[PDB]
């Protein structure tokens, strides 16, 4: 009966046009959305899930709505051909969480990183110190290719919820036929 506004954030960059896995990375990230939208459904039907892209533009394809059938129609045929842009992706997600119909829901943002980020260390810590002053918990999940133990992401998780925050888990999946079992061990219940 937890009241939150879960904002899922997929990646349709150009680097998703490959399969390091035995299935498709697009099929891997699409089924990742299925197991979290069904997760937030069965826990509390009074929540809402909305998808957002960040490649070359942060086009709001579906508004943050408690329905799921609009999302399932739009999870397909995404056509990944863009360049990944991550620095504006947090600010457009927090701008979506201000335009809500009810200000009694909690704030949770999950994001799907399927491409390497190339950003300044100043630009991540200004967003990190902004969300500290805004009390916003953002989860970061890595897909596909991943540099193990990055400087930028790990310092962003640290500066997000430092000094006994929430526990926004950094999901580091290895390449191989592993499905979202790393995404349903801890983050489906202990986010």
């Amino acid at each position: 009966m937890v009241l939150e506004s879960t904002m899922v954030c997929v990646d349709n960059s150009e680097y998703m046009r490959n399969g390091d896995f035995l299935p498709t990375r697009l099929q891997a990230q699409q089924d990742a959305v299925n197991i979290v939208c069904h997760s937030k459904t069965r826990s509390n039907p009074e929540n809402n899930v909305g998808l957002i892209t960040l490649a070359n533009d942060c086009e709001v394809l579906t508004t943050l709505t408690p329905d799921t059938g609009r999302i399932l129609s739009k999870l397909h045929t995404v056509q990944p051909k863009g360049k990944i842009t991550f620095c504006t992706g947090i600010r457009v997600a927090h701008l979506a969480l201000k335009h809500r119909q009810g200000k009694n829901h909690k704030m949770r943002i999950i994001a799907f990183v399927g491409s390497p980020v190339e950003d300044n260390e100043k630009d991540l810590v200004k967003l990190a110190k902004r969300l500290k002053k805004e009390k916003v918990n953002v989860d970061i999940i890595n897909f596909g290719e991943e540099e193990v133990n990055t400087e930028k992401l790990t310092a962003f998780v640290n500066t997000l919820n430092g000094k006994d925050g929430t526990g926004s888990h950094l999901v580091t999946v290895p390449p191989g036929p592993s499905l979202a079992d790393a995404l349903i061990s801890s983050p489906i219940l202990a986010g």
Partner: protein
């Protein structure tokens, strides 16, 4: 397949540091850093005789590819078939690459340019107008490729070596420079581009010089050093004078493609001094007599009537001709660019325009204040 890359390791400098990188990125099954390394191998300015080895590897790509943007695939295969230098089967191979991807990405519009750009050497009449037309009709609803207009200009440059192509080429020579923003290639090809740009703007039917041309800096910064005449003959044409010495020195200079058009360029400036001499006097006494045209355009009196009917026919002016005083009335309607020196007197006429209207409002507001309400 791992044995194929061990035996094809050689014939590229610093072999193992880039062939161990290629075999590891094959096993990770990614297709972007793998793609940029193959594009790095083609971009390498060497002889590149390994076309027979890469055409099995490009075959090995397309078996289990099904992920890669065919835009980069078409762009990398057109350099390979250009290196193979085989015009018998280049068309049959490229059509096979064109039909094997008909997907929602607009790579076929680059393939149709790749058809013509390999075909425009011999027999350029039967299908070339069709494949020129096919690209521009398929240049709709997406002005964001910027390469399909680039290759459409490159085939138009090969189509410039025809009998009639002088107006649409110069208009496309602008549009290529309109879409491109960077230069990314040395001076030793751009100085030939601004030379034939100066010829296409010169040998034209409905073009005088088309100002906002000499401000465009890629031509004057590269040819101010060298030959110093094509800029100078455009100085005299923008000024509109005859300047019989300077337009003769370009006739001595440029021997081809100018003896057949020297009477035309004398004809083009005599219709061009008119819009200068009606610009010299700012509509004070625009009724100009025959003596001033015969002196400026150095034309005889028996041709000043045929000269101005040609100018009224084109549409550079909409005046009339009186012969009871042998004076030509002029209502100039075809404007152009001017300099900062005409800007100065334009403001002083505007400051006179400002202070006369404001003074008369003060006479009306003072006189009719009691009946204003």
């Amino acid at each position: 397949v791992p044995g194929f890359l061990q035996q094809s390791q050689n014939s590229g400098p610093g072999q193992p540091a880039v062939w161990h990188r290629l075999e590891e990125l094959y096993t990770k099954k990614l297709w972007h850093q793998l793609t940029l390394q193959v594009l790095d191998f083609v971009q390498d300015p060497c002889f590149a005789q390994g076309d027979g080895l890469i055409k099995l590897y490009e075959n090995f790509i397309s078996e289990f590819e099904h992920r890669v943007n065919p835009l980069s695939l078409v762009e990398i295969i057109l350099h390979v078939v250009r290196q193979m230098t085989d015009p018998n089967v280049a068309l049959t191979f490229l059509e096979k690459t064109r039909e094997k991807v008909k997907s929602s990405d607009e790579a076929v519009i680059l393939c149709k340019t790749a058809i013509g750009a390999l075909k425009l050497n011999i027999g350029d009449l039967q299908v070339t107008k069709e494949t020129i037309e096919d690209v521009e009709e398929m240049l709709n609803n997406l002005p964001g490729v910027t390469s399909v207009h680039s290759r459409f200009y490159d085939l138009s440059s090969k189509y410039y070596q025809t009998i009639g192509n002088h107006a649409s080429y110069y208009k496309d020579a602008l549009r290529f420079l309109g879409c491109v923003d960077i230069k990314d290639l040395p001076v030793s090809e751009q100085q030939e581009r601004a030379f034939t740009l100066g010829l296409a703007g010169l040998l034209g039917e409905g073009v005088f010089n088309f100002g906002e041309l000499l401000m465009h800096p890629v031509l004057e910064s590269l040819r101010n050093t060298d030959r110093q005449w094509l800029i100078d003959t455009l100085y005299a044409f923008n000024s509109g004078n005859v300047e019989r010495f300077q337009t003769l020195k370009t006739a001595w200079g440029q021997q081809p493609d100018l003896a057949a058009n020297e009477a035309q360029l004398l004809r083009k400036i005599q219709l061009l001094c008119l819009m200068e001499m009606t610009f010299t006097r700012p509509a004070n006494h625009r009724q100009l007599t025959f003596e001033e045209i015969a002196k400026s355009a150095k034309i005889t009196v028996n041709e000043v009537e045929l000269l101005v009917m040609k100018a009224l026919s084109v549409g550079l002016v909409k005046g009339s001709i009186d012969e009871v005083d042998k004076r030509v009335h002029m209502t100039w309607v075809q404007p152009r660019v001017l300099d900062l020196q005409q800007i100065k007197g334009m403001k002083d006429r505007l400051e006179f325009w400002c202070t006369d209207v404001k003074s008369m409002e003060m006479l009306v507001e003072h006189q009719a204040h009691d009946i204003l309400t």
